[PDB]
Design a protein around this ligand. Structure first.
Ligand code: SF4
Ligand code: SF4
Ligand code: FES
Ligand code: FES
Ligand SMILES: [Fe+2]
Ligand SMILES: [Fe+2]
Lengths: 633, 633
């Protein structure tokens, strides 16, 4: 099972699944081998009914699409559509939050409110929305309207791009025509330009992709902004992770998907229903997180993380998961079928994300508490139905310190320098105690033994004094392997990095260091990493493509991860991807993405499947940046 | 060559291409065989980096996607993305026209103006925009703003759906949640819901598809509305079609793509440059049309159609095509390479639609005349470079009577009944002189011998007294085979239909019938057919799903054709498709699309590759509708 997942709790559940004849993602992957080499290389096109078209990577015919589409066009069109799809997910999420905020302040959704007034005001100020002598509700209404306005063309470009990146960066991007006009506008334009008989120049197509990736960035940043206003900006919190956070004597409820609009209410209502749960013979309702929405409630409330990404089915295999409450994105639809074997009640809540065989309970923001109670009562009923049934919860969990929003990080640093909080970080970059910064982001992928890339690369970087920050299922991987436990600083961290983590931790009253890796939150909260890096850029008076900062989507899966990787490149970062995106069938496209894009944005992809080699390449990228700033490395 | 195209001019050019070693779409198709059966059936998914996934249509593993996505989910997601892509094209086109109208009336694009004031006012009235005591420029500004507003969420749904279909139809669609909230909104929502781990219920996914198809309808209708305001509502016009419309002694300039914003100016400026062209040794500039933008200028100005869709390369093979002026959509990128052999100057004009190797001349509406002149001067230079070179223009063309906008049709009918113009049409439906109405729409497809389905089905329906209307490359097929020549009425038409065409024609001063098939314009002008059918529905006090009206995308290719077929189904029409869309890998999806959707919208797909059988099925559909209305059949 170690060949499938490096997580021992997951290995234990794989054995149980095998024993019980429950097919898993790894089994479905095995059944899929060998996968289609045209698809793998990107040399397939189904954009019209003359297809499917393919191009032999090497050899003889077919060499070109039926319409004349070259390998470089077909590869760039496929990639662009993946970016658009990612953008559509992150921005759909953000749009949902924008409508919820609007409803809240118009009196239509009393379960929601402005929880972070300071965040609201700072966002308003960043957007140019006056606050002076204005009601919070009116400021919030204006912020919500601005959010919604960024989805379409108007007299300004997308403000959730132009107001969050330094002017110098916006200038470089504007010069290449890369600033998005509107989020859904760009998504639609990608789908148009990649449809048959339209855009057929690789460079032109890829530039459209870069621009659509910035529309994804805007959706991410908007999502984080709005979730913070509504639900609170995260601060350091201590919790736990892995399957051992499930409790046989509790009603175990997983929140799974992405949007805190749902999970946040689940969390608060679950506390209100403790006595009902105990009436049913449970100790209480034990809310646990899966995927991003688990990250959202972990960051804000310390809700323990059950599992992530590829291993999500394993939570069910325990026999103790009474409910899995879904909104959208990254939910393996297998869960609806597995539920029949495991007894878990899988509940969908969003009109556009249903799964055949799951129970659908519409969740309206206007009736959030009522709908939450309905959902949680299904969970309590399920708990009762497993009275007397043995469960197998692996007794495996890690301690997780998380909640490192950019505000939280700035606050932590301010204990070392009150009026110049970034300076201690920069001081230690300059003196070599911090070599650079690496953001781990994105998914697990069944092709990579689960977590192997994240942990292998993180271990090498931490020993080389890289400050490691993490989001999404990257943060999930690292938390499950102990990288968010400060007790592991001595083992994992180089002396320089240890010194800094310890210094900041001791200044914050901990008597101990910050954790080895800083959990910056969900995938939309990759925007937090952008906020930090942009604040560092502004403080140094240089652009992001001069900073010793890199990203690694070390086990990427979702179209969202492709969009995130692409905007990381577009904002100026060397960006590692540890799975093959479908680009290798075109050398020219690969060359643009891994090399010539440096001349456009300063960032570039690093495609490297071997994690030890990936680490070396990321370190080289970091050190090149150090050299560029005249620093020793 | 008859196995490739039924068009003799195309056959002649195929022989020339073969002789000269110029690879064509048919050669690239042959080189692609056998095509991938997973793609053909829809049983392939590349929506994440765990893929590519496939499902054996029959047999053993793989039976399910890696994430657990079933055949029915994978098929419905693929289809939905095609609908979104189609919607993105038609609506991008419409958006372009909306911005042009806005610029025109704000004084920023003096080459454009309100040409059809009556159309402007009627659209304003339909949208609820007051005109009483308003300047045309201000009304137009409000119409342009309303157009742009339909792309995003607002306090009203998409008005270019809700104001163009009868209330009863809007009610049925609203009841199923099918009315689009915003055009780009829906496009984005499709891309989201079809991304990994989101929507995973075939019925739910397909309903999203139906709704996105109505967003495509809105883009089509908006495009037609705006093009009419800007460039004039078509009226009956006589012209010619096929390769024989090229002239060895003229500068031959093809307008190819979709948007009249470009081609309309090309047409007017070309007339202004006659003396320059003659200075270069040409008789003049001979503008000819390819694809929809050719249809636009044919409908409004009588510009002859050179060719369409699959055979577009053949115009170049003549040796006489001096320029091919492109905007976007349906342009085989092969043209850029073929140009090198044929001498043709291929010119792209839109930022989001470039082709490697083509000359790009940016076309700004603000500088339309200047940019048009630059483009046409490249054409004149090219004409000069072929002085003394033999050309082979097949001496093959047909007479085409076209320009049958819905207003034109209503006007024609009004000569028989001034104050109830639809009544003569309905009278003849009731008495059996007109059996029903069939709209031919959409593309040619290299898989079908070019035009074979259109002409085979049209011939059978016309003999059975079906009133045949046509748009896009369906209209192209039929025009090239003589179906738009009134001299062919005796040969093609049943006695009943002949009687009616003759009656209307003689009432309109022709001394002869209307043509066998009524050309209703470009693909966005499928919206004109909707206007006619909706006016008939309103006049009869019944919904569209009770009318003896069917559609046939007999040789469909583009994602746009899939979107159009899907909205034809959604508005209540039996809708034939003569190529296999990638749905056969899921029986449940096929069953929904061909059967159970009847219970939702009253329309349904008829998938039938055999054109004689397709004709029989369309006739059966028509006659079933007749029976439903209590009429003999
Ligand atoms: S768009 Fe071109 S390459 Fe793609 S399926 Fe159609 S003919 Fe083939
Ligand atoms: S979304 Fe599911 S079926 Fe599609 S490629 Fe990814 S794992 Fe395979
Ligand atoms: S030929 Fe396998 S992905 Fe299309
Ligand atoms: S396996 Fe051929 S279309 Fe994907
Ligand atoms: Fe996520
Ligand atoms: Fe078209």
């Amino acid at each position: 099972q170690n060949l499938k997942s490096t997580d021992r709790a997951v290995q234990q559940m794989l054995d149980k699944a095998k024993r019980e004849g429950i097919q898993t993602v790894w089994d479905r992957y095995e059944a899929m081998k060998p996968q289609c080499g045209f698809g793998e290389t990107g040399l397939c096109c189904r954009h019209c009914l003359q297809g499917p078209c393919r191009i032999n990577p090497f050899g003889d015919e077919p060499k070109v699409g039926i319409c004349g589409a070259t390998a470089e066009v077909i590869v760039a069109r496929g990639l662009d559509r993946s970016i658009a799809a990612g953008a559509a997910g992150h921005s759909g999420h953000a749009k949902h939050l924008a409508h919820t905020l609007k409803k809240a302040v118009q009196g239509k959704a009393a379960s929601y409110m402005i929880k972070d007034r300071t965040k609201l005001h700072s966002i308003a100020k960043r957007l140019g929305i006056p606050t002076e002598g204005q009601k919070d509700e009116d400021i919030a209404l204006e912020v919500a309207k601005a959010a919604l306005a960024d989805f379409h063309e108007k007299d300004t470009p997308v403000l959730w791009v132009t107001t969050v990146l330094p002017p110098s960066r916006v200038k470089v991007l504007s010069a290449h025509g890369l600033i998005p006009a509107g989020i859904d506008h760009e998504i639609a334009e990608i789908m148009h330009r990649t449809s048959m008989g339209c855009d057929a120049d690789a460079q032109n197509l890829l530039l459209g992709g870069l621009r659509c990736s910035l529309a994804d960035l805007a959706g991410c940043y908007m999502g984080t902004d709005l979730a913070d206003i509504l639900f609170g900006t995260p601060a350091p919190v201590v919790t736990e992770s892995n399957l051992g956070v499930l409790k046989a004597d509790a009603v175990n409820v997983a929140v799974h998907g992405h949007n805190p609009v749902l999970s946040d209410i689940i969390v608060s209502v679950s506390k209100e229903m403790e006595n009902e749960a105990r009436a049913a013979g449970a100790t209480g309702i034990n809310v646990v997180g899966i995927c991003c929405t688990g990250n959202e409630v972990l960051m804000r409330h310390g809700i323990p993380a059950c599992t992530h990404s590829v291993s999500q089915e394993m939570a069910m295999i325990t026999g103790a998961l009474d409910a899995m409450i879904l909104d959208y994105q990254c939910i393996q639809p297998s869960v609806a079928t597995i539920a029949e074997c495991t007894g878990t009640t899988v509940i969908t809540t969003m009109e556009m994300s249903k799964i055949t065989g799951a129970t659908h309970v519409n969740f309206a923001e206007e009736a959030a508490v009522e709908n939450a109670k309905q959902i949680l009562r299904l969970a309590i009923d399920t708990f009762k139905r497993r009275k007397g049934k043995p469960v197998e919860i692996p007794n495996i969990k890690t301690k997780v310190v998380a909640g490192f929003s950019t505000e939280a990080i700035i606050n932590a640093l301010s204990k070392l320098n009150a009026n110049d909080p970034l300076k201690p970080l920069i001081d230690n970059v300059v003196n070599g105690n911090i070599r650079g910064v690496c953001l781990f982001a994105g998914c697990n992928n069944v092709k990579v033994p689960q977590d192997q890339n994240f942990t292998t690369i993180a271990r090498k970087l931490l020993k080389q004094n890289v400050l490691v920050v993490a989001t999404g299922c990257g943060a999930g991987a690292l938390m499950r392997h102990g990288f968010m436990d400060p007790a592991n600083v001595d083992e994992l961290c180089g002396d320089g990095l240890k010194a800094v983590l310890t210094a900041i931790g001791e200044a914050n009253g901990l008597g101990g260091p910050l954790p080895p890796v800083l959990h910056m939150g969900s995938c939309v909260d990759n925007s937090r990493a952008v906020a930090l890096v942009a604040a560092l850029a502004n403080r140094l008076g240089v652009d992001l493509d001069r900073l010793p900062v890199v990203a690694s989507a070390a086990e990427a899966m979702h179209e969202k991860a492709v969009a995130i990787g692409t905007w990381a490149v577009t904002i100026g970062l060397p960006t590692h991807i540890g799975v093959l995106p479908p680009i290798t069938g075109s050398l020219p496209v690969t060359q643009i993405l891994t090399s010539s894009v440096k001349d456009i944005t300063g960032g570039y992809f690093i495609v490297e499947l071997d994690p030890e080699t990936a680490a070396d390449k990321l370190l080289a990228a970091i050190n090149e940046r150090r050299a560029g700033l005249g620093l020793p490395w």
